[PDB]
Write a protein that binds this DNA or RNA. Structure first.
Ligand SMILES: [Mn+2]
Ligand SMILES: [Mn+2]
Ligand SMILES: [Mn+2]
Ligand SMILES: [Mn+2]
Ligand SMILES: [Mn+2]
Lengths: 116, 115
DNA sequence: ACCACATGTCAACGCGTTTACACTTCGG
DNA sequence: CCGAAGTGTAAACGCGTTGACATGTGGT
């Protein structure tokens, strides 16, 4: 299963969900909150869960049960490949000269600093 | 703020800005590059409304190349939108040392492709 | 028991796309 | 001139969202 064949037709919402899960696996409403933080608005759970269900059916997300009212969503191996593939495309178009590159380098350096 | 523009746009539109972040191009050149990305035919009836909409949002400038050809380029605002989305994806991808070194090798390979 | 939490589900609604027809412009 | 290039554009159409109802769980 190639993640490219399955992840280039996803909507911005779905791709943002995968990026959130790229940080760490999360239960439903925790994803909602982090999406809400990115969008600056409220995200309707009636939109989240069906989109999580779609990503599951596409093979990009696994749905496990923490307790029998809570599910934990996480990226499959194909899901992580989808996140990597999207980043390699974004970068291949952004890294157009040396200034663009070092900009990315300081971004990644600052990100690694926040992790300590 | 760069976030407020980037968040709303659709995937199709951000792909337009990613394309333009590499280089300013004319309409059908954007079309062909997205057709290579999607691996599907891209309807021009879909592209031109989207580029124009991105102009009304102040993220793309529409200039005259010929009087049958337009050149589309990123405004400084559109660039900040591209950079902000890049920063968010990276902020959530660089979760440990291996993730960072993965991004470093990608960026290094990209830089070596420049010549 | 109480009442959050967590997720399920849907159809009226919103909205962008598809699929056309259409124009003016440049090359040979 | 004649065809392709390049872009314009609108209505049927497809298709995901909105905003709500809904169930069942876990905590206190
Ligand atoms: Mn979606
Ligand atoms: Mn909600
Ligand atoms: Mn990709
Ligand atoms: Mn093509
Ligand atoms: Mn076309």
């Amino acid at each position: 299963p190639d993640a490219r064949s399955d992840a280039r037709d996803l909507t911005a919402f779905q791709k943002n969900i995968l990026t959130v899960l790229g940080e760490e696996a999360r239960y439903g409403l925790a994803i909602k909150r982090e999406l809400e933080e990115y969008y600056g608005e409220e995200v309707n759970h009636g939109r989240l869960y069906p989109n999580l269900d779609d990503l599951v059916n596409k093979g990009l997300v696994e749905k496990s049960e923490l307790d029998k009212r809570t599910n934990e969503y996480a990226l499959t191996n194909e899901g992580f490949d989808a996140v990597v593939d999207d980043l390699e495309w974004t970068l291949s178009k952004f890294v157009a000269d040396a200034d663009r590159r070092e900009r990315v380098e300081t971004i990644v350096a600052d990100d690694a600093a926040a992790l300590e």
